[PDB]
Design a protein around this motif. Structure first.
Motif, mmCIF file in Angstrom:
data_model
loop_
_atom_site.group_PDB
_atom_site.id
_atom_site.type_symbol
_atom_site.label_atom_id
_atom_site.label_comp_id
_atom_site.label_asym_id
_atom_site.label_seq_id
_atom_site.Cartn_x
_atom_site.Cartn_y
_atom_site.Cartn_z
ATOM 1 N N UNK A 42 0.818 -1.213 0.000
ATOM 2 C CA UNK A 42 0.000 0.000 0.000
ATOM 3 C C UNK A 42 0.851 1.263 0.000
ATOM 4 N N UNK A 43 0.169 2.393 -0.152
ATOM 5 C CA UNK A 43 0.823 3.697 -0.189
ATOM 6 C C UNK A 43 1.071 4.148 1.242
ATOM 7 N N UNK A 44 2.318 4.033 1.690
ATOM 8 C CA UNK A 44 2.675 4.436 3.035
ATOM 9 C C UNK A 44 3.616 3.478 3.733
ATOM 10 N N UNK A 45 3.947 2.377 3.071
ATOM 11 C CA UNK A 45 4.735 1.297 3.651
ATOM 12 C C UNK A 45 5.984 1.097 2.803
ATOM 13 N N UNK A 46 7.148 1.084 3.448
ATOM 14 C CA UNK A 46 8.409 0.765 2.788
ATOM 15 C C UNK A 46 8.844 -0.639 3.196
ATOM 16 N N UNK A 47 8.791 -1.569 2.246
ATOM 17 C CA UNK A 47 9.274 -2.933 2.421
ATOM 18 C C UNK A 47 10.558 -3.070 1.621
ATOM 19 N N UNK A 48 11.599 -3.632 2.232
ATOM 20 C CA UNK A 48 12.827 -3.883 1.492
ATOM 21 C C UNK A 48 13.567 -5.085 2.066
ATOM 22 N N UNK A 49 14.200 -5.845 1.180
ATOM 23 C CA UNK A 49 14.802 -7.125 1.515
ATOM 24 C C UNK A 49 16.318 -6.996 1.429
ATOM 25 N N UNK A 50 17.015 -7.873 2.150
ATOM 26 C CA UNK A 50 18.474 -7.960 2.034
ATOM 27 C C UNK A 50 18.878 -9.396 2.360
ATOM 28 N N UNK A 51 18.946 -10.228 1.327
ATOM 29 C CA UNK A 51 19.295 -11.623 1.490
ATOM 30 C C UNK A 51 18.331 -12.402 2.359
ATOM 31 N N UNK A 52 17.077 -12.521 1.899
ATOM 32 C CA UNK A 52 16.000 -13.245 2.584
ATOM 33 C C UNK A 52 15.732 -12.676 3.971
ATOM 34 N N UNK A 53 15.720 -11.355 4.082
ATOM 35 C CA UNK A 53 15.638 -10.724 5.397
ATOM 36 C C UNK A 53 14.917 -9.385 5.227
ATOM 37 N N UNK A 54 13.604 -9.393 5.452
ATOM 38 C CA UNK A 54 12.764 -8.248 5.111
ATOM 39 C C UNK A 54 12.752 -7.245 6.256
ATOM 40 N N UNK A 55 12.354 -6.017 5.938
ATOM 41 C CA UNK A 55 12.193 -4.955 6.927
ATOM 42 C C UNK A 55 11.075 -4.047 6.446
ATOM 43 N N UNK A 56 10.044 -3.881 7.263
ATOM 44 C CA UNK A 56 8.826 -3.191 6.865
ATOM 45 C C UNK A 56 8.669 -1.956 7.740
ATOM 46 N N UNK A 57 8.795 -0.777 7.137
ATOM 47 C CA UNK A 57 8.743 0.495 7.851
ATOM 48 C C UNK A 57 7.481 1.237 7.434
ATOM 49 N N UNK A 58 6.508 1.299 8.332
ATOM 50 C CA UNK A 58 5.267 1.982 8.036
ATOM 51 C C UNK A 58 4.994 3.164 8.936
ATOM 52 N N UNK A 59 3.722 3.355 9.285
ATOM 53 C CA UNK A 59 3.342 4.450 10.171
ATOM 54 C C UNK A 59 3.843 4.219 11.589
ATOM 55 N N UNK A 60 3.824 2.973 12.047
ATOM 56 C CA UNK A 60 3.943 2.675 13.463
ATOM 57 C C UNK A 60 5.292 2.110 13.873
ATOM 58 N N UNK A 61 6.197 1.885 12.944
ATOM 59 C CA UNK A 61 7.502 1.392 13.311
ATOM 60 C C UNK A 61 7.972 0.338 12.342
ATOM 61 N N UNK A 62 9.020 -0.371 12.738
ATOM 62 C CA UNK A 62 9.696 -1.325 11.877
ATOM 63 C C UNK A 62 9.506 -2.740 12.402
#
Length: 93
Positions: free
Chosen positions: A12-32
RNA sequence: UGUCGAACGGCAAGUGCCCCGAAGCCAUCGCACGGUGGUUCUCGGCUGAACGCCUCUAAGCCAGAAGCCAAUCCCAAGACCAGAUGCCCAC
């Protein structure tokens, strides 16, 4: 053994998802929310412009195809977690 | 009881026998002490697909048996310890 088995979720519009070698990190409104998915052997990739996350298993029989929708569901429970969050209610009976 | 003549001091009877007896040893016949962490089995679960829902299980997690493994406890470098040290010698 098939050649390409995949399933994508839409970010969705507002969420940054990014991977680094099978290891995701999701940064949205409320934290990571990091999820260490090292034990899976999948091709995790994010489009970052059309805002969609993609899991790919290439030559899998049936056992790693089960871990595709597991990975898609886990990222969706982090996109729900950083946008809307989770709340349970328990009751003494 | 016998026996040094008697008292004294004793002695003999493989420690004569009887009563009390220190010290030492010793009794559940007295007295004191006997402790920690984890791992994971059964199992109950959590997220979660395969299988557009469902599901403790397939990935992944949680909690967890007097079992098991450590801590404590006992022996301990033939476990060959350039572990540390005191003093002499020898380089």
């Amino acid at each position: 053994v098939k050649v390409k088995s995949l399933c994508t979720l839409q970010i969705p519009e507002g969420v940054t998802v990014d991977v680094k070698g099978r290891k995701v990190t999701v940064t949205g409104k409320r934290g990571t929310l990091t999820k260490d998915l090292t034990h899976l052997q999948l091709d995790l990739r994010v489009d970052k412009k059309n805002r969609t996350f993609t899991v790919i298993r290439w030559f899998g029989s049936k056992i790693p195809i089960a871990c595709l929708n597991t990975t898609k569901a886990h990222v969706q429970n982090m996109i729900t977690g950083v946008t809307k969050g989770y709340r349970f209610k328990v009751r003494c009976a």
